[PDB]
């Protein structure tokens, strides 16, 4: 629901969400090939 939302918020007032007390599955993000600008630092996508 965060990623495939109905509509995102405006860029100047962006959609803000807090994630805690959760078993966050990053594997669903990792396996998806629709992403074309997977640019991050500090952590590898496979070791995330």
């Amino acid at each position: 629901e965060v990623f495939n939302a109905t509509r995102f918020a405006s860029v100047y007032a962006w959609n803000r969400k807090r994630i805690s007390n959760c078993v966050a599955d990053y594997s669903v993000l990792y396996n998806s090939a629709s992403f074309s600008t997977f640019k991050c630092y500090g952590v590898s996508p496979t070791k995330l």
Partner: antibody
């Protein structure tokens, strides 16, 4: 802009050498990362390490040189890479290149400096 | 650190033909690829970034494609000055994946 190297040349086997890359026309901001890459005389390129610019101290090392290289930023325009226990297999040409914050390719490569590990 | 295999080691194409190079990744990189052309006695020069984007001053003959772990570099209308060595590199600088180069491929006119 321009990138230049100094501190290479002949190094005795088993010793340690220091190579410095100097920038001209810009600063080592957090939007650009330094990197070190080597080339064997008749072989291809081998990556060494990178260090994020700006106030960030984040550094990344290669698997092969994890224990034999040390990369850290000394100033916004000068920087040093130190390698220990030099062997004849380390005789290569070192290139100092910059990386944009977009995770785009290497642009504005350095001319390169040749290091020789022999007596 | 991701390891990059580039094939073929050596390729030879006539004038005006098309030469293709394949670059494979051990793990998924999500683009973040850079293609380089190096002439003897010269530092490598950038050709393609993000595996699909061409930089300024780069001819349209060079074309990048592929995604996931398989990538392709295509050079059309080969010229006498195109004789060089081509390399592929992941651009994961602070991602713990490293930026390890693959085996260079030389082109013969």
């Amino acid at each position: 802009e321009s990138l230049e190297e100094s501190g290479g040349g002949l190094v005795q086997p088993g010793a340690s050498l220091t190579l410095t890359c100097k920038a001209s026309g810009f600063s080592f901001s957090s939007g650009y990362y330094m990197c070190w890459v080597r080339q064997a005389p008749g072989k291809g390129l081998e990556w060494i390490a990178c260090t994020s610019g700006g106030s960030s101290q984040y550094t990344i090392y290669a698997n092969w040189a994890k224990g034999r290289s040390t990369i850290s930023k000394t100033s916004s325009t000068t920087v040093t890479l130190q390698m220990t226990s030099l062997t004849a297999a380390d005789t290569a040409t070192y290139f100092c290149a910059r990386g944009p914050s977009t995770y785009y390719g290497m642009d504005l490569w350095g001319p390169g400096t040749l290091v020789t590990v022999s007596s | 650190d991701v390891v990059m295999t580039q094939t073929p080691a050596s390729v030879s194409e006539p004038v005006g033909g098309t030469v293709t190079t394949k670059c494979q990744a051990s793990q998924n990189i999500f683009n973040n690829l850079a293609w380089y052309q190096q002439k003897p006695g010269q530092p490598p020069k950038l050709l393609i970034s993000d595996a699909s984007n061409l930089a300024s001053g780069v001819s349209s003959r060079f074309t990048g494609s592929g995604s996931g772990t398989e990538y392709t570099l295509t050079i059309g209308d080969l010229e006498c000055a195109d004789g060089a060595t081509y390399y592929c590199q992941s651009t994961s600088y602070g991602n713990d994946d490293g930026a390890a180069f693959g085996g260079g491929t030389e082109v013969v006119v």
